[PDB]
Amino acid sequence: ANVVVRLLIRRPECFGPALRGEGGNGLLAAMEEAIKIAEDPSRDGPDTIHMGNAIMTFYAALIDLLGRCAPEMHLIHAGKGEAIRIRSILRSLIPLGDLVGVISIAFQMPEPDMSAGFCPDHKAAMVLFLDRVYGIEVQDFLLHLLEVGFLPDLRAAASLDTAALSX
Amino acid sequence: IQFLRTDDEVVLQCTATIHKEQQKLCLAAEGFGNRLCFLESTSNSKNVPPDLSICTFVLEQSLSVRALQEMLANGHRTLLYGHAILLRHSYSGMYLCCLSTSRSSTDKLAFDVGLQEDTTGEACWWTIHPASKQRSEGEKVRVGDDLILVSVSSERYLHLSYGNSSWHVDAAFQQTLWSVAPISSGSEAAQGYLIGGDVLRLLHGHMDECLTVPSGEHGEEQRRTVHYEGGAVSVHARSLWRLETLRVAWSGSHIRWGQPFRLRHVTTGKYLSLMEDKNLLLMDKEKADVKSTAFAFRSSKEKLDVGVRKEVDGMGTSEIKYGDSICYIQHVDTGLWLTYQAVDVKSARMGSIQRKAIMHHEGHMDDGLNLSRSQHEESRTARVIRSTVFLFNRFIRGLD
């Protein structure tokens, strides 16, 4: 994990251009535009590679890699200094509000439609990154996150009778 | 071949190639009033001089990263590649460190670099690495080597970020050249002898006067005038001068006869300048020409030698005393010499006793310039006075 962070910071171009660069802001606008690419067929092969879905999977994989690259479950992080250093590096490199906005998108719940778009597994990487990098000991933070990015998805999951489309 | 041994004054420069032109920019820190660092242009020094006083750093400790972490979890050395150094600013006395806030919006991940008083923490330490394959870790660093510094805390590179007006150095992930120019090697600085970059003043053998300017009761146009004054002015803030040498390397060496350097008024920040239509006055840094503002000291009255010394790379020879060293000011362009006048007519002779300075060929054979260094305490007091009057005047104008 440590050498992975060292190499990724030595070559910053490994990160997506919308995150890393003097250009794009971050994951929020990146995934807004990704949803736009998935919706608009002018940006694909006229089974084709959905460019928006590809961007979404790349960013989700990067977030999951960073989250699993987070120092620890705070076993050694309590007494270590290098672990705190790596965790601070991860925090300062990925804004928290960006992650909150990414989680709070509230994808639709569908007759079937296509899963080559904003898949529910994309937010799993964000949840893992939050759990392993930032964590939850703050009451109003937990309540705000639940109110904004968790309740709509919970309601969408619960409002199911027969049309079992996405497990 | 000279090694960088600890307890020496150094200057951290870098080379920037922007807009298809090359510039040499130094690392500077004001110290009092603000914490963040900025840039001083040693290049283009022919009309705008660089403030070498606030660009000087001293290396306190040179330990391994590992010995550093042992000390954290708890003697003239030689610098080795791969160690971690502690850069204390020469003037302010604080320490260079990696900050936690960011001002340049162009870098959302980089950190700023500034000064802090406390040595506790990994922010104030900078590990040192070579910039060439011929030099590896564990090697001694010579003068002029291509060095690069990484923050121990954030593991971020001492990057020279670029902006339209945001010319900062930040803690980024892209490397940038950093060269170390020696100033004072930390060797035996001969006590009682003049050293480059000092803040001192001049006195007379049988007059007890100093070359000063009018006090703050008048406007700065009136303060631009230069004269001699005695009495309580012997120990004041406006009676101090700084010898700013043109060279950026070994500027804090022993100053010798005939070499050129500017005289800076610490209280006002202006330099002594001459146009032939008038006498010498004080003017700001935006037009400080080398030929207009360069001077020297001679040990006699003749013109036997002018262009005899060109450059000496090192501490130099310890020649000029302070007490028993009768120096004579000589301009590099006109070769005119100091003279005291009697402008105050007999009608006002009993009042304010000021005898103006006119720089002339002949002079009087009674000058006897005896040098006297001002202590670090009042030199710092004078320069912080200059900084605070500048800031307060800016605030006053902005609010008015």
Side-chain angles (χ1 to χ4, degrees), chain A residues 28-127:
Chain A
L28 191 59
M31 257 185 185
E32 294 293 328
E33 307 165 336
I35 282 288
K36 296 166 63 147
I37 308 298
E39 276 306 315
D40 203 325
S42 267
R43 307 258 206 176
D44 283 317
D47 198 75
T48 192
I49 290 293
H50 314 86
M51 283 290 327
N53 187 316
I55 300 197
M56 290 191 210
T57 61
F58 170 83
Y59 275 142
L62 177 63
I63 289 305
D64 191 13
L65 163 78
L66 289 186
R68 303 185 191 270
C69 202
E72 189 53 31
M73 105 144 191
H74 310 111
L75 188 153
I76 62 151
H77 186 273
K80 199 70 154 79
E82 197 185 336
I84 297 170
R85 188 183 303 169
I86 292 303
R87 188 199 194 186
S88 87
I89 284 189
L90 265 68
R91 290 174 144 137
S92 64
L93 236 122
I94 307 299
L96 171 66
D98 206 9
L99 295 144
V100 180
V102 165
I103 294 160
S104 309
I105 292 186
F107 53 83
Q108 79 275 1
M109 195 264 264
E111 64 183 1
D113 323 15
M114 62 169 38
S115 287
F118 201 74
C119 66
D121 299 75
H122 280 343
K123 73 167 183 76
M126 308 295 154
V127 164

Side-chain angles (χ1 to χ4, degrees), chain B residues 56-105:
Chain B
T56 303
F57 293 91
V58 190
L59 283 82
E60 273 203 340
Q61 313 333 319
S62 167
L63 304 168
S64 44
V65 187
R66 186 188 179 263
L68 175 143
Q69 65 205 23
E70 186 264 342
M71 290 316 256
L72 283 171
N74 171 37
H76 293 287
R77 295 315 188 180
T78 302
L79 196 157
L80 275 297
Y81 281 114
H83 280 170
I85 61 183
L86 178 62
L87 290 164
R88 176 168 57 76
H89 185 251
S90 179
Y91 181 76
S92 87
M94 299 189 277
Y95 299 87
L96 192 75
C97 79
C98 178
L99 287 242
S100 66
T101 186
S102 185
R103 323 308 271 185
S104 314
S105 86

Side-chain angles (χ1 to χ4, degrees), chain A residues 6 9-10 12 20-22 81 85 88-89 92-93, chain B residues 106-107 109 111 122 152-157 173:
Chain A
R6 301 278 146 75
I9 66 156
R10 285 297 104 87
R20 221 291 18 174
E22 291 74 51
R85 188 183 303 169
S88 87
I89 284 189
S92 64
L93 236 122
Chain B
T106 185
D107 295 331
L109 57 85
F111 283 1
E122 41 181 349
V152 181
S153 86
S154 73
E155 269 73 355
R156 289 166 156 92
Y157 276 71
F173 293 127

Side-chain angles (χ1 to χ4, degrees), chain B residues 9-22:
Chain B
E9 282 83 354
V10 307
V11 175
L12 277 69
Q13 308 205 52
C14 70
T15 67
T17 69
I18 186 72
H19 305 338
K20 321 164 295 283
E21 63 195 343
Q22 211 180 333

